[PDB]
Amino acid sequence: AIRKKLVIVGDGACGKTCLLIVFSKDQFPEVYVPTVFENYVADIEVDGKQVELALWDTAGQEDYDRLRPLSYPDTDVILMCFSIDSPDSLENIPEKWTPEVKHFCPNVPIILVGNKKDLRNDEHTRRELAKMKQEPVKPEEGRDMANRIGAFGYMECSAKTKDGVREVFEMATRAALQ
């Protein structure tokens, strides 16, 4: 198996930690959801190729501009996350996260991932957002942002229901192999 490295980036409330936890355990924890994620090396077989995919989180490094880039050396694929319940997390993608990742990870594929897709049709979410003249991120808004930033592709998932989670990591492995 060939070894590849994945790093997930995004704002503090984007759901990146939960996404790594659910994928690495293959389950949304029933008793306790961990606060942090250390690392993990997933055995993934995608399109007949076996890969050891090392997984890393940047949670806790968002306010520390000199510590955060230490997570980037030799990254093969970037998952760039935003939460669908937070149109503000999508706005910080093009002019904060994208120029940083392009600088430290030149030529590395970026997959833009819309997390918490289950909240798009959640009434409590729609009510809270409507108070700030907002609505959950629409699928075309996510695709257009991915197109604009030069992303390898656009994907959505829900760590809560596990829907789309396996597909995100299998596609990330294919991107890392190219």
């Binding site: 924890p29 008793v31 306790y32 961990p34 606060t35 942090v36 250390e38 690392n39 993990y40 090396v41 090392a54 890393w56 949670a59 806790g60 490094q61 306010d63 520390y64 501009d65 000199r66 510590l67 230490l70 997570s71 050396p73 030799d74």
Partner: protein, 245 residues
């Protein structure tokens, strides 16, 4: 890690580590607080274990089996003895707080009610100054360590055989040389996330809520100082490239 501590922290949570008849005696809010304190100690036990793999398995193994040029092993594992002393001492204090809280007749049932004071002590005074000095040095030497590792693995056959040998066991899957270095760099930024969530469930005793709020502030001040004190070292960097930063 030693077997006694590994077994005490084998469960996914505090609610699964204690006996169910003991769990049943506590309110949900106490269980939520104890689950996060348990995660802080469990991840500190794993972090000390990462430092022991670096010092005992890799560093000492290279000194005892390989013929590396002087200064090469220190370049691969900067500050590892100092980091091990800081965290092993901190881990000792956390585990002693848990041990004192055990019920008589039990090696697993406990509730830690006073963590804040221990965190203020760790993140203030001389121990905080030593953490700041050591992480500023370690994190500034991080890129250099990774490049030295890659150079040695690509050109030295005996070095490549040594690495492949000691990292072959399944228990080392997540802990190659480069993985250990990033695990250590990332440890310090996990503390505010853990402390904030402990604080969220520690409002029942006002002294405890105040102590955890003070500890959270000290950890953030330490991180800001470390972040401001980092500049990556590069082998063969010229003075002109440095003063034109």
């Amino acid at each position: 890690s030693m077997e006694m501590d590994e077994k005490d922290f084998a469960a996914d949570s505090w609610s699964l580590a204690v006996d169910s008849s003991f769990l049943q005696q506590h309110k949900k809010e106490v269980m939520k607080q104890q689950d996060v304190i348990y995660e802080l100690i469990q991840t500190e036990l794993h972090h000390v274990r990462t430092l022991k793999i670096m010092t005992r398995l890799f560093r000492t193994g290279m000194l005892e089996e390989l013929h590396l040029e002087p200064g090469v092993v220190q370049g691969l594992f900067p500050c590892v003895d100092e980091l091990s002393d800081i965290h092993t001492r901190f881990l000792s204090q956390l585990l002693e707080r848990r041990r004192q809280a055990l019920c008589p007749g039990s090696t697993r049932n406990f509730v830690i009610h006073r963590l804040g004071d221990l965190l203020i002590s760790q993140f203030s005074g001389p121990s905080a100054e030593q953490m700041c000095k050591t992480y500023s040095e370690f994190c500034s030497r991080h890129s250099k360590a990774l490049k030295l590792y890659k150079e040695l693995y690509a050109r030295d056959k005996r070095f490549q055989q040594f690495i492949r040998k000691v990292t072959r066991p399944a228990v080392l899957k997540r802990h190659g040389v480069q993985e250990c270095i990033l695990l250590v760099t990332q440890r310090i930024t996990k503390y505010p996330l853990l402390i904030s969530r402990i604080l969220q469930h520690s409002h029942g005793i006002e002294e405890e809520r105040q102590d955890l709020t003070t500890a959270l502030g000290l950890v953030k001040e330490l991180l800001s100082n470390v972040d401001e004190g980092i500049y990556q070292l590069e082998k063969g960097a010229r003075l002109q490239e440095i003063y034109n930063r």
